[PDB]
């Protein structure tokens, strides 16, 4: 109706979908994501990436006693002017042939691991846009970068990113959104009198 049209009653809604439902597989059965409605055209809501989050059962299924969890977070501004608070969790593994039951890190190994986590994931951002970062963290490969960069210090099973928050977003740029989706323009029907 006039006085609150529907296309601006929308445009603020975020939806929380499952990455398994968005990607067809089931190894993304955790890791829900948020899509923010930006532009309405022709009974379609075109969305953009708004965040990422684990389910609580995943990290409760990861936490075990007799190890340490090193968790880090950095507030990074991308190659757009999106600024993101992006998190990271990692758990200290025990090696194969380790007979002591503990496998704790000595907290300087925690500070050094958290240092290289912050450095290399703030190198993975700033060197990405939002679309490039999203396509980077779909196939879990920043976790492989953390694992390869950190096996010099501690073994570190199941590193994950676990949470990505938007903080500020630059402007709209309908052209950039429609280049993320695909084109479209309508000349429609005409009244027949």
């Amino acid at each position: 109706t006039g006085l609150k049209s529907a296309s601006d009653a929308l445009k603020g809604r975020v939806v929380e979908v499952c990455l398994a439902d968005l990607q067809g597989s089931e190894d993304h059965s955790f890791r829900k994501i948020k899509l923010r409605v930006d532009e309405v055209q022709g009974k379609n809501l075109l969305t953009n990436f708004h965040g990422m989050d684990f389910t609580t059962d995943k990290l409760r299924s990861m936490v075990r006693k007799w190890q340490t969890l090193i968790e880090a977070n950095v507030t990074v501004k991308t190659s757009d002017d999106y600024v993101l608070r992006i998190f990271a969790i990692a758990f200290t593994r025990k090696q194969a042939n380790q007979v002591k039951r503990h496998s704790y890190a000595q907290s300087s190994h925690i500070r050094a691991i958290r240092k290289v986590i912050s450095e290399i994931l703030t190198k993975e951002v700033q060197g990405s846009t939002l679309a490039q970062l999203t396509s980077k963290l779909i196939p879990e490969v920043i976790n492989k970068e953390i694992e390869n960069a950190t096996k010099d210090i501690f073994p570190l099973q199941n590193i994950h990113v676990r949470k990505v928050k938007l903080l500020k977003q630059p402007k709209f740029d309908v052209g950039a959104l429609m280049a993320l989706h695909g084109e479209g323009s309508g000349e429609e029907k005409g009244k027949k009198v």
Binding site: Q41, V141, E145, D173, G175, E187, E188
Partner: protein
Amino acid sequence: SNIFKLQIDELLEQVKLKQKHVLKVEKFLHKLYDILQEIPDWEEKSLAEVDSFFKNKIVSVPFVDPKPIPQNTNYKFNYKKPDISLIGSFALKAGIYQPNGSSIDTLLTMPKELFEKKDFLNFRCLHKRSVYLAYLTHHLLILLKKDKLDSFLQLEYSYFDNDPLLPILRISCSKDYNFYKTRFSINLLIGFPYKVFEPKKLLPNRNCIRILPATPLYNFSVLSSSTHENYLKYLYKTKKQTESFVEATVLGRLWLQQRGFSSNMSHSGSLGGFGTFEFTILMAALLNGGGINSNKILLHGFSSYQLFKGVIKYLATMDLCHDGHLQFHSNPASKYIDEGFQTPTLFDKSTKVNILTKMTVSSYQILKEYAGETLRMLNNVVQDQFSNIFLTNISRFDNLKYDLCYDVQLPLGKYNNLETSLAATFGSMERVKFITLENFLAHKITNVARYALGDRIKYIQIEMVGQKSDFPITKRKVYSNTGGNHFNFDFVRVKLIVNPSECDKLVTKGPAHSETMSTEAAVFKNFWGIKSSLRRFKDGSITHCCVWSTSSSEPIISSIVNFALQKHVSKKAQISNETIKKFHNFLPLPNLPSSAKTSVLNLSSFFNLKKSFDDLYKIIFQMKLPLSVKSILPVGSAFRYTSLCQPVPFAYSDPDFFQDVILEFETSPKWPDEITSLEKAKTAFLLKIQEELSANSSTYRSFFSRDESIPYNLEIVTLNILTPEGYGFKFRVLTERDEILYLRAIANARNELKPELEATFLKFTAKYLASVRHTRTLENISHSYQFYSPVVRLFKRWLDTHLLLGHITDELAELIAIKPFVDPAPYFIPGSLENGFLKVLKFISQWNWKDDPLILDLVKPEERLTLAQYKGIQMNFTNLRNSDPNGTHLQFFVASKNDPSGILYSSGIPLPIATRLTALAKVAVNLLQTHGLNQQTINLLFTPGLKDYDFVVDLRTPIGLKSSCGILSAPSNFPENLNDLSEKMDPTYQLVKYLNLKYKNSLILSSRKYIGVNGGEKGDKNVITGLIKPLFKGAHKFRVNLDCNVKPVDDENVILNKEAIFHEIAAFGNDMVINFETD
């Protein structure tokens, strides 16, 4: 904030010549006012004798229509003599030494009783002004005959401030007592009493004129031609208070002149209506006010730059036309009421005249964005742009100020054909509202343009080209039967600066459909008629709208202007613009289904390329290698929306066909420590990728090329995936063991091989590393700068037509072309392909290398280079220009946040090629200002070369390659083996590459790589031009380090073996070559 004061001081030293050309014109002014002191007077007289007075003299009388008749002009004249004093720029010592020739003022007021107190009727106050000027004209001719100066001076009727209702008498010093040198004209304008009126009939809504419409032009003209001296009174008062005023006058009128807003007039199809004394009296109002709490925005004590900043900031933020204005009085405050007048408005309470009604609404509207842009570019501490603010001239070209320029030919004939040629109304109320047909038709055509475009444009300007504000004594006015008129133009130039997000929107909606139509729906369907329609949309919404058809050649704004002209102003008028048509069909038409009816801002071929890459990227991430693929990501020109041939499926002979993509894996520590085994391990990974792709995705086709672009590593094999959708991709592998390995080759290289290997490492950085963030920032910038991609395709077509592209890199072309977008100042952002391309060429003509870099920030308007970053790239430019000052081997220093080193994209270009680029741009800008924007001008601008280039080796093909290159005037398949791709492609590019690579010290070659963008209708005409080096001007003796091709005739001297070298050029391309020429 340091060098601005030195800029003000050097500017005043450049503009001041105030001792030499001032006292001699003061003495000739002494002679002039003594002559009009000794003029004889004239008694009380009448019209039935004044017609016989000026019956067959040498001097005519000017007038406004109708020629006044004695029935309703029972009128009388009294010739009393008024006082004389000086007014204006000379009176305030604000004289500027423009080579055009500035003006200078005389005071001719009137006594208080000689003319009756009924100045509110039908222009006979200005008719007694005209007969006053008529007898002063004839007897001033008499007095100059008796003072013998009939030789060199010329007195001429003109229009005071381009007003057809206000003539004046100007002396020009035409060809001790001869004079032909300084600013020429001296004008003879009048005044009135300070009280000619009743004070309730001065605000411009009033009326008493013949058949209640307002006459704002009329009661502004009588108020201006009364008061030319109270402005001097309180202006001199404010000049006695503040001492920054005269500097503010000269630099503000310099600003207004160098962006072309001169106070000539506006209403009659003139850009302008704003200038020096309006600027300075509003400056004085800003001194004595500016706030609703009587906030004195300015103080009369500080410097001139702070005062100019305050005035520009105020008239940038504060809107004066559409909602509200600030009133100021003289004999002071400035109060903001929120009542707009639909007129650029600032009001008085002393003279009681709206001053800026000589300014029109659209010219104020565009001056407001000019002042806002000036505020934006003087309120940033990073750069140094006083040349952009004051020193450059932006109005000297007809095209760099306005994105679109249409020629309205109006062959309507005469006044008695006006009724049934002009499709508007013409009669009483329009003629009393707008005095002449000039400003009547101009106001109507800018209203029709504003309604026909709406949000499809930003601002509008109307120019009556060919308008002459001077006329001889042989006519009472300006008689002009020019191009089919009887008024003061020949044709019309309608000029547009657009909103590039909404030009080619093919539906321009009105309001929605109610049960009974609103006033907007009424005027919309009246305005459109046959085009108007009622449409329901995909979201279920009924709007009034109209549908246009995008062509590649025509922007639909052209069809909108053409329709709204042949419906609402005339019917037999013509609208021409072939500049945009020539520039739009210079871009190649892709062989796509229904691609003559596409737009020019349509990137859908690029989007289909990106979707085919998305499918390939999916299967590569889902295949399983010994290392997980970290990032596979595209870096090609058609991924940053740059390629000439926008990608058509199944097109081998496009040199931008195979798009570069870079993949990298996890950081394995088992990468080999040596460069050749490293490249062989990378291609072992590529061999694994290729065999798994040919195992499962059999619809993809794949072979292996061999990269040769990075020198001295000869193992860089890249595979090429041919998608089923019809596209091709060169895959590279980047490791983290590449840059450290190259850098240690720099480290332990031999000591005279280090710059050579540094060039190798620069090629590696430009290809692998820096290109990724390059294509990322250009793809993120090209959606906020809408016209960047078509002006780059046009600019690289220009480079390939003039055959430079084999030396100047495409990323250098892209950075050169992005400069007038990310830094459009002092101009606006390019809203047309024409404006963008000509602004690129204007910049590269204007860009002097050896003191100025090309450092630029790739950011959207409204990530940055800070002050430290800007000083760092400034300082390393100075480092390079003191290690080499004259540009021996680094010719361009273009740099950004993604590359602060400059040398990266501009290494390896020869000084002949760089000087040919700057010279060809200088040639183009001087020829464009010489001839003008014409079709033959644009055609000769795109004629290839024909200059001091020496060889023309002309080569052809077995088959022209535009069918298999996708430029239509049909390949849809790949052959059964992937080596017929070779004979479908063309060899001229790497042929001339190998030839220049061998002969690089003796002569430098050039060709065109896109063979039939420029090589005719078939795709065959490709030339090879050679230029001999600066060493080879004599005949040297044989030493060891010559690197030439020898033919000595005597024993000492050796000369070039020219016959054998182009014979073996012909042998290297002996199927391709057909012809040789030497200039």
